[PDB]
Every structure is written in C-alpha cells, then in structure tokens.
Design an enzyme around this catalytic site. Sequence first.
Site, mmCIF file in Angstrom:
data_model
loop_
_atom_site.group_PDB
_atom_site.id
_atom_site.type_symbol
_atom_site.label_atom_id
_atom_site.label_comp_id
_atom_site.label_asym_id
_atom_site.label_seq_id
_atom_site.Cartn_x
_atom_site.Cartn_y
_atom_site.Cartn_z
ATOM 1 N N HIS A 48 10.107 -25.324 -22.790
ATOM 2 C CA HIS A 48 9.972 -26.051 -21.712
ATOM 3 C C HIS A 48 9.088 -25.157 -20.653
ATOM 4 O O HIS A 48 8.435 -26.008 -19.724
ATOM 5 C CB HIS A 48 11.596 -25.437 -20.777
ATOM 6 C CG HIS A 48 12.531 -26.516 -21.238
ATOM 7 N ND1 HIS A 48 13.157 -27.326 -20.303
ATOM 8 C CD2 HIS A 48 13.224 -26.845 -22.642
ATOM 9 C CE1 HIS A 48 14.167 -27.971 -21.229
ATOM 10 N NE2 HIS A 48 14.008 -27.765 -22.392
ATOM 11 N N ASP A 49 8.441 -23.917 -21.058
ATOM 12 C CA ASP A 49 7.495 -23.523 -20.206
ATOM 13 C C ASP A 49 6.301 -24.073 -20.690
ATOM 14 O O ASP A 49 5.411 -24.386 -19.827
ATOM 15 C CB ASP A 49 7.717 -21.750 -20.344
ATOM 16 C CG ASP A 49 6.266 -21.116 -19.699
ATOM 17 O OD1 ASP A 49 6.149 -21.738 -18.523
ATOM 18 O OD2 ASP A 49 6.015 -20.040 -19.960
ATOM 19 N N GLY A 64 1.048 -24.980 -18.360
ATOM 20 C CA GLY A 64 1.328 -24.619 -19.663
ATOM 21 C C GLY A 64 1.916 -23.405 -19.867
ATOM 22 O O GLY A 64 2.959 -23.201 -19.151
ATOM 23 N N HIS A 175 15.225 -27.404 -34.120
ATOM 24 C CA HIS A 175 16.746 -28.117 -33.950
ATOM 25 C C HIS A 175 17.524 -27.683 -35.226
ATOM 26 O O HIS A 175 18.740 -27.667 -35.203
ATOM 27 C CB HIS A 175 16.862 -29.636 -33.744
ATOM 28 C CG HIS A 175 16.374 -29.613 -32.358
ATOM 29 N ND1 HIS A 175 16.553 -31.070 -31.556
ATOM 30 C CD2 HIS A 175 15.902 -28.952 -31.263
ATOM 31 C CE1 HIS A 175 16.158 -30.884 -30.242
ATOM 32 N NE2 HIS A 175 15.782 -29.705 -30.078
ATOM 33 N N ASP A 181 24.903 -27.583 -24.847
ATOM 34 C CA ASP A 181 25.745 -27.112 -23.820
ATOM 35 C C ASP A 181 26.032 -28.117 -22.514
ATOM 36 O O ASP A 181 26.893 -28.058 -21.971
ATOM 37 C CB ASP A 181 25.431 -25.646 -23.248
ATOM 38 C CG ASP A 181 25.091 -24.718 -24.303
ATOM 39 O OD1 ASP A 181 25.917 -24.610 -25.530
ATOM 40 O OD2 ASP A 181 24.179 -23.709 -24.149
ATOM 41 N N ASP A 193 22.908 -29.017 -36.512
ATOM 42 C CA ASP A 193 22.891 -28.878 -38.103
ATOM 43 C C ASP A 193 24.101 -27.902 -38.101
ATOM 44 O O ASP A 193 24.797 -27.335 -37.351
ATOM 45 C CB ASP A 193 21.625 -28.799 -38.806
ATOM 46 C CG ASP A 193 21.251 -27.102 -39.105
ATOM 47 O OD1 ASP A 193 21.813 -26.395 -38.386
ATOM 48 O OD2 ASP A 193 20.260 -27.188 -39.544
ATOM 49 N N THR A 195 24.360 -25.352 -40.025
ATOM 50 C CA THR A 195 23.787 -24.050 -39.959
ATOM 51 C C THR A 195 22.751 -23.554 -38.740
ATOM 52 O O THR A 195 21.645 -23.209 -38.983
ATOM 53 C CB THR A 195 22.813 -23.613 -41.164
ATOM 54 O OG1 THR A 195 21.583 -24.844 -41.390
ATOM 55 C CG2 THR A 195 23.658 -23.976 -42.679
ATOM 56 N N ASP A 200 16.509 -23.325 -41.599
ATOM 57 C CA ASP A 200 16.527 -24.066 -42.718
ATOM 58 C C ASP A 200 16.111 -25.527 -42.680
ATOM 59 O O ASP A 200 16.094 -26.066 -41.278
ATOM 60 C CB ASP A 200 17.908 -23.979 -43.662
ATOM 61 C CG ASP A 200 19.194 -24.354 -42.874
ATOM 62 O OD1 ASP A 200 18.952 -24.900 -41.985
ATOM 63 O OD2 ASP A 200 20.224 -23.817 -43.317
HETATM 64 C C1 HEM Z 1 11.442 -34.546 -28.238
HETATM 65 C C2 HEM Z 1 11.342 -33.323 -27.748
HETATM 66 C C3 HEM Z 1 12.686 -32.651 -27.572
HETATM 67 C C4 HEM Z 1 13.814 -33.004 -27.136
HETATM 68 C C5 HEM Z 1 14.289 -34.119 -26.361
HETATM 69 C C6 HEM Z 1 14.740 -31.717 -27.086
HETATM 70 C C7 HEM Z 1 16.114 -31.964 -26.572
HETATM 71 C C8 HEM Z 1 16.949 -30.763 -26.480
HETATM 72 C C9 HEM Z 1 18.283 -30.878 -25.984
HETATM 73 C C10 HEM Z 1 18.794 -32.213 -25.403
HETATM 74 C C11 HEM Z 1 18.716 -29.632 -26.195
HETATM 75 C C12 HEM Z 1 20.266 -29.206 -25.801
HETATM 76 C C13 HEM Z 1 20.286 -28.436 -24.572
HETATM 77 C C14 HEM Z 1 21.794 -28.340 -23.869
HETATM 78 O O1 HEM Z 1 22.195 -29.509 -23.457
HETATM 79 O O2 HEM Z 1 22.148 -27.095 -23.894
HETATM 80 C C15 HEM Z 1 18.014 -28.653 -27.088
HETATM 81 C C16 HEM Z 1 18.077 -27.524 -27.296
HETATM 82 C C17 HEM Z 1 17.308 -26.656 -27.880
HETATM 83 N N1 HEM Z 1 15.863 -26.934 -28.214
HETATM 84 FE FE1 HEM Z 1 14.944 -28.931 -28.211
HETATM 85 N N2 HEM Z 1 14.141 -30.553 -27.292
HETATM 86 C C18 HEM Z 1 12.940 -31.155 -27.947
HETATM 87 C C19 HEM Z 1 11.796 -30.237 -28.399
HETATM 88 C C20 HEM Z 1 12.140 -28.926 -28.595
HETATM 89 C C21 HEM Z 1 10.893 -28.007 -29.159
HETATM 90 C C22 HEM Z 1 9.527 -28.437 -29.294
HETATM 91 C C23 HEM Z 1 11.592 -26.769 -29.404
HETATM 92 C C24 HEM Z 1 10.832 -25.285 -29.728
HETATM 93 C C25 HEM Z 1 9.821 -25.595 -30.419
HETATM 94 C C26 HEM Z 1 12.907 -26.731 -28.935
HETATM 95 C C27 HEM Z 1 13.913 -25.855 -28.927
HETATM 96 C C28 HEM Z 1 15.252 -26.052 -28.735
HETATM 97 C C29 HEM Z 1 16.166 -25.057 -28.996
HETATM 98 C C30 HEM Z 1 15.959 -23.695 -29.937
HETATM 99 C C31 HEM Z 1 17.633 -25.356 -28.531
HETATM 100 C C32 HEM Z 1 18.821 -24.645 -28.578
HETATM 101 C C33 HEM Z 1 19.346 -23.872 -27.413
HETATM 102 C C34 HEM Z 1 20.633 -23.435 -27.787
HETATM 103 O O3 HEM Z 1 21.163 -23.574 -28.890
HETATM 104 O O4 HEM Z 1 21.302 -22.603 -26.572
HETATM 105 N N3 HEM Z 1 13.160 -28.286 -28.651
HETATM 106 N N4 HEM Z 1 16.804 -29.715 -26.947
HETATM 107 CA CA CA Z 2 19.882 -24.874 -39.562
HETATM 108 CA CA CA Z 3 5.010 -23.220 -17.949
HETATM 109 MN MN MN Z 4 22.703 -23.010 -25.466
HETATM 110 MN MN MN Z 5 24.512 -22.187 -19.992
#
Ligand code: HEM
Ligand code: CA
Ligand code: CA
Ligand code: MN
Ligand code: MN
Length: 367
Positions: A48-49, A64, A175, A181, A193, A195, A200
């Site tokens: 996001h940052d 960025g 992912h 949440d 997933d 896990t 993985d």
């Molecule tokens: C098309 C690009 C992406 C979309 C649409 C997307 C979408 C999402 C959504 C909807 C969530 C759930 C947020 C919530 O409701 O709590 C999420 C979580 C997350 N995203 Fe993605 N994301 C994208 C790309 C990325 C990228 C590039 C990264 C890091 C390199 C990333 C890392 C994460 C992580 C680690 C979570 C989990 C947060 C948690 O489990 O507390 N995402 N993302």
């Molecule tokens: Ca996994």
């Molecule tokens: Ca930024």
């Molecule tokens: Mn979360």
């Molecule tokens: Mn929260």
Amino acid sequence: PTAVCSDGTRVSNAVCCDFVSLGQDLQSMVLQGDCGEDAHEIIRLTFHDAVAISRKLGPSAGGGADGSMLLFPLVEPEFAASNGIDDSVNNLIPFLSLHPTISAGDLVQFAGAVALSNCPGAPRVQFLAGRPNHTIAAIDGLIPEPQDNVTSILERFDDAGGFTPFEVVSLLASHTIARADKVDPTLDAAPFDTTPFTFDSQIFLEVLLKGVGFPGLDNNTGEVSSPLPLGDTSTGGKDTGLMRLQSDFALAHDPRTACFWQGFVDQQEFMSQSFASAFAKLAVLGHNTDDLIDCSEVVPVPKPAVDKPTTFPATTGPQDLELSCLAERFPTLSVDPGAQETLIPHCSDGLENCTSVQFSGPATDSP
Ligand code: HEM
Ligand SMILES: [Ca+2]
Ligand SMILES: [Ca+2]
Ligand SMILES: [Mn+2]
Ligand SMILES: [Mn+2]
C-alpha cells in the site's frame, strides 16, 4: 568503509547498524518472531505504501515507497482501498520516534523484510536504505482492489513501476500468508490459503480448484466462491473458512497470467526467488537505487521452508481443478487424507486463542 554491528553482523556501511536495534524492537514489541497477523498486515502495508506512484500522472500523484502512509496517517489509510491498513500504520508510527535516524519509508520496507523473515519458506529480501524522511500524501485511486480486472491490474502495476505480468503474479505469492478482515463484514481473518502462516505455493494450487461456496456472505465486492468455505465461526469459533478474491481467480485464468500462476505450483524455490526479485523492485519505487545504500545484511535469515510437499487439501483432488495453462502440465501431487474439510487454524501454533499486538494511533478504519 566496512564495520561490524553490535550483534556481530558484518556490514558494508556503518549506517546499516541502526537497523539492527530497529529489527530487534520490531520483533519484541510487535511481530514477536511470528508469521502472524501483525506480520501479515505489515507486509500488506509495504504494498500500500509503495504502489501509490504513477509514471503517467507524474511525481505529484505519489512518491512510492516513501512512508507516506505513516507520515500522513489521516489521509491515505482512510481512502476506501486501504480500509484496515490502520492496524499496521498505527503499529509502526511509534518506531519513528523510537528510531529517529530511520526514515518512515525505510521503516515500512525494513519492517516488511523482518516480517517476511518470520514466515517459513519466505526469501531473505534485499533491503536498501536511504529513502528520504519527508514526502506528501499520495492521491486516491492508485491501489488495486480485488474487484478489478486483469487489464486494470496489469496497467496499474505497469504505470507504478514497469512491472511485467510475471512480476505481478510473483508479487501475489504474498497471498500465501494472507487473510481478509474487511472483504466480508461478517468474517475476521478469512484465509486465502490453507497455510496462512507458511510461505508456500498452496495459494497457487488452491485458487485453481473449483469454487463450491462461501465462508460468509455470498455477495461481497471483490470476492468469489471458495473451494473450502467451511469454518467453525457459525458456532463461535475463530477458524474462518477459506476466502477467494476475484482478482486472484482472474489472474489464475487470464491468458496473460495463467501460466505464470500455475508455474509456481509445487515450485517452492522458483516462487520464493521470483517473489524476492519483484518485491525488491516494489520496495524502491520512487527512488533511484544509486541514491540508496545496500543494507541487505541486516535483514534476518528467514525461517527455512517446511519439509511438507505441496499437496491437495483434504476433500479436494486433481478432479476439482479448473486449468487454463496449455504450456505446462499441472504436476501430480498427493492428496491429504480426510473425509471432511480440515479447519484452517486461526493461529500459527494451531490453536484459536492467540492474540496480537495493536498500538493505538491516528489512523482509522470503517465498518
Ligand atoms: C492486484 C493486487 C492486489 C490486490 C487486489 C490485493 C487485495 C487484497 C485484499 C482484498 C486483502 C484483504 C484485506 C482485508 O480485507 O483485510 C489483501 C491482504 C493482503 N495482501 Fe494483497 N492484494 C494485492 C497485492 C498484494 C501485494 C503486491 C502484496 C505484497 C507484496 C500483498 C500483500 C498482502 C498481505 C500480506 C495481506 C494479508 C494481510 C493479513 O492477513 O492481515 N497484496 N490483499
Ligand atoms: Ca500458505
Ligand atoms: Ca507511499
Ligand atoms: Mn488482517
Ligand atoms: Mn483490523
């Protein structure tokens, strides 16, 4: 010139040494050595940052990887696309004053590198330091959302930093340790997933299974049917069923991305290395690397990849796959035994009762 840090780490530049104590404090105060909720949210924050930058709109649209989320916590974290990012933002803000020599941009990316290191199988990512300590808030509209189509997603990533379709799919390996949440207002921590505490390739396999139901509501924006929707939350438990994002499904089946998606299935090292390369590029958006210093040596050595092979989760099998890639045969894999879906644990220790650190702070979120 070279120097040695208080923990014994050999560094090419003594200014890398300030990150050692920062890493220690991030672990003791927030991450707690775990690939848990706070680690995951911090990794989400790196994206996001960093992604809030645009070649076509020019520098005024966003800087960025610049710490803008931390430095202007009343602006970007409250844009709709970042709902829920307040948790990570509020957890990191205190480190700005605890470690005043380290910029907000550097803090965000270093925290992500440390968080990744807690996740078995994750790469030891590059870490370059020296992002300036001042910026302005980005504009709204620069963060992809799960309802977006592949053309939109690919254009956004290309405009942010020239990412190719392969690099986009590589980044989405994240992912593998992700849960939702906010996507479903009735669910907390719905994993993507089986896990969510292991870095993985299960995410790649599991998005290719046919969807059969929903872990909560059936009509949330950006969500599609899940192959493993069962949890114990209907009886008060915290093991939420598996959720599938529309964007992950779309990437898995689009002609531009489907072969890259399938190519990571049961290819642990290829996946982790590919993620690492794309993530290093993400981490320096908004910067010329000639203006940064290499402090990769102070990123902790990650937890090793697990011994377990990539497998079909209980009650699934190759007959359930929806395949789109002609260029590579889907590999033969074992099926986990069991007649009913296995609950996906809410905690990395297998239990349901774990709690996470959350600092209060200025960023907020919406219901
Ligand atoms: C098309 C690009 C992406 C979309 C649409 C997307 C979408 C999402 C959504 C909807 C969530 C759930 C947020 C919530 O409701 O709590 C999420 C979580 C997350 N995203 Fe993605 N994301 C994208 C790309 C990325 C990228 C590039 C990264 C890091 C390199 C990333 C890392 C994460 C992580 C680690 C979570 C989990 C947060 C948690 O489990 O507390 N995402 N993302
Ligand atoms: Ca996994
Ligand atoms: Ca930024
Ligand atoms: Mn979360
Ligand atoms: Mn929260």
